[PDB]
Design a protein around this ligand. Sequence first.
Ligand SMILES: O=P(O)(O)OC[C@H]1O[C@H](OP(=O)(O)OP(=O)(O)O)[C@H](O)[C@@H]1O
Ligand SMILES: O=P(O)(O)OC[C@H]1O[C@H](OP(=O)(O)OP(=O)(O)O)[C@H](O)[C@@H]1O
Ligand SMILES: Nc1cccc(F)c1C(=O)O
Ligand SMILES: Nc1cccc(F)c1C(=O)O
Ligand SMILES: Nc1cccc(F)c1C(=O)O
Ligand SMILES: Nc1cccc(F)c1C(=O)O
Ligand SMILES: [Mg+2]
Ligand SMILES: [Mg+2]
Ligand SMILES: [Mg+2]
Ligand SMILES: [Mg+2]
Lengths: 349, 348
Amino acid sequence: VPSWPQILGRLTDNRDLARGQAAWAMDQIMTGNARPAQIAAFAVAMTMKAPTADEVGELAGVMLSHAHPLPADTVPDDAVDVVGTGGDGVNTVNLSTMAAIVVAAAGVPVVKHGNRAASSLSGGADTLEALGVRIDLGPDLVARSLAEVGIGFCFAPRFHPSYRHAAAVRREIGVPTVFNLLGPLTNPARPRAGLIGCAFADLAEVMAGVFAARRSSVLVVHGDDGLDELTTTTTSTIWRVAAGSVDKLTFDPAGFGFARAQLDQLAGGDAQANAAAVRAVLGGARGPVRDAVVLNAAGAIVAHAGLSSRAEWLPAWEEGLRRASAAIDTGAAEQLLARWVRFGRQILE
Amino acid sequence: SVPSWPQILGRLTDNRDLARGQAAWAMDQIMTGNARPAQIAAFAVAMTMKAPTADEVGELAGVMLSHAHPLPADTVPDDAVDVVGTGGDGVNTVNLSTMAAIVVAAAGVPVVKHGNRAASSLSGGADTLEALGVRIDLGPDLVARSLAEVGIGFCFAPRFHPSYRHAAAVRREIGVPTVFNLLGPLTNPARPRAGLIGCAFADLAEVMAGVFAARRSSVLVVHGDDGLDELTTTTTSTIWRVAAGSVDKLTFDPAGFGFARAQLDQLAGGDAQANAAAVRAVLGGARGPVRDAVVLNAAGAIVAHAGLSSRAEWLPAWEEGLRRASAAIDTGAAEQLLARWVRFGRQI
Ligand SMILES: O=P(O)(O)OC[C@H]1O[C@H](OP(=O)(O)OP(=O)(O)O)[C@H](O)[C@@H]1O
Ligand SMILES: O=P(O)(O)OC[C@H]1O[C@H](OP(=O)(O)OP(=O)(O)O)[C@H](O)[C@@H]1O
Ligand SMILES: Nc1cccc(F)c1C(=O)O
Ligand SMILES: Nc1cccc(F)c1C(=O)O
Ligand SMILES: Nc1cccc(F)c1C(=O)O
Ligand SMILES: Nc1cccc(F)c1C(=O)O
Ligand SMILES: [Mg+2]
Ligand SMILES: [Mg+2]
Ligand SMILES: [Mg+2]
Ligand SMILES: [Mg+2]
């Protein structure tokens, strides 16, 4: 007999839910049957109890069942995502977006999930728009983009219309909850690999567990400086997901020859400013922004390799970094962005 | 800084006590209709799971009182008493507080009871009073008249706390008990200085006591060790005795006064008509477990009242309370007082 008092009562007692209860809650939420107060109570109670991977897996699985899918046979078997929770409160250039472009230019199909900024000045989606990339595409056109360009972008509001009740509650309460994990977990193209950033150190393990239950090849990452990206300012924590199991590691880019950068060297601005930062890096400019992009691109490439994993860790990273650097320095990344802008401009005719 | 929902909710979800004034800010937003239902719910739940402090709950109740309809000046005696609990004990008993309150008034102590309809039980104190023919819908002036002419008044919470309607609605939508469930007993709009106050939630009783301590009330905050938000007859109770700005926690055992141990099912209630029939039976002199529980709680309230003009010590105060409560039933005074109260309400 599932109900709000039962489920909320269990969470406020600090108990894990019974199997199916989180799914019931998410069903209510996604059908418009949960009142805002119920949505908010659930989000908060789940957060303070401390969600489990099974619970979050139920939320994401129900959410995905309401999402628009891409057409059959349009997503390569080895597609990767590069995306994080956001919410790190540091306001950097768009590292996941830049890395995605480089990764795609290295020959790895990228189907990227994303959204506008929530607290930062310019999110991935905003910066893409400033670059001339069409972010508003439906399933058929993202699929075509992936085939013709090597990359596609699923704009979350376009693909998850039924999440609008939850999204509004998220904005009303302001505080991060378990719902902040759902974007990265609900890419509607379901790529099987990814580099997934998590701003909340205490939730990164749960997100890893959800990918492990899917048998995805993923690195869930949290910079030890608070970034929802692999950082160059210090070490990072990586939850490596492979063969359905999770493995926690401390990662140090110094071991690959990266100098320690400062956070302000990665600082972003508005969409225009961040668009110019993308153009600078793809044009081959050296410096801390390139270093961070290359590092994160390599991470995604390593996750992709893990789909066919012989893959010793250190060699995988070495080849990842080399591939990312070549993708920029051959001009391929700059050319890929231009091809992507061109594709969007062809849609009119 | 400037207060905001993200700041306050963030602090609670980080498991931190709020800064002084933050709970009051939140409660004022809620009471003025400025908070969204999602914000109200997040706050209620986050405060509950953090574990609210006495200072925070005092801010909530104090803000809530500032928006209530007061009784007119000089109409509540200095030594008026309340008998009321959080409810939510999940046992669905007869209306023990309400019966006790009638008995207490009939013993000659002024009573101004705060109450409400049932939330999760079949018949709450207001429902039962209504079924008895007592008027539950009176405003400030007529409650004051009831108190002067009958020696008892009932403040119906929705009538005295209109601005609580947004919080009340959220409470009903989410169902789960929260810190808001403490607020009824803490916000009697007549502000009596004594009380027997039941708490269904063992972990929060102390918090409720802390709030009363900062008011210089004389209050017994009680939790039956079987879970009742009343002094129980089935086992011991925990009492947080509040007076002179301090709290004296103790374990209470009515077997020390010769009460036989009862079973919870012997105190079981029903619908409004059934619970009204139980009131009439007790007030008519019927002996048994229900009477015993009524007499115990009535004495408890009389003890709280004695703690105002505090001549008497704990034990003798209890012995006198039990005598007065028993006598109020056996001499017909309680039955007579209820008839008088019903009469008052019908004379407009
Ligand atoms: O405003 P915030 O809550 O801080 O979030 C900043 C951005 O990070 C996330 O995207 P993603 O990782 O795709 O973009 P990036 O290129 O900015 O890393 C999120 O969807 C936002 O676009
Ligand atoms: O439905 P529940 O949430 O369980 O609450 C039952 C009753 O308990 C409280 O009252 P009070 O102590 O005034 O009344 P009673 O003890 O006479 O029932 C509350 O105002 C309800 O009327
Ligand atoms: N912000 C959102 C993210 C994913 C899906 C959505 F419908 C929204 C939204 O409605 O704003
Ligand atoms: N942070 C996100 C990443 C991918 C998709 C999304 F909807 C979001 C989001 O939090 O809005
Ligand atoms: N249920 C209530 C309790 C106290 C004050 C109120 F306004 C209500 C209500 O609106 O239902
Ligand atoms: N439980 C209560 C006690 C006194 C006044 C009230 F409004 C309530 C209530 O919870 O509604
Ligand atoms: Mg990112
Ligand atoms: Mg980031
Ligand atoms: Mg009671
Ligand atoms: Mg009770």
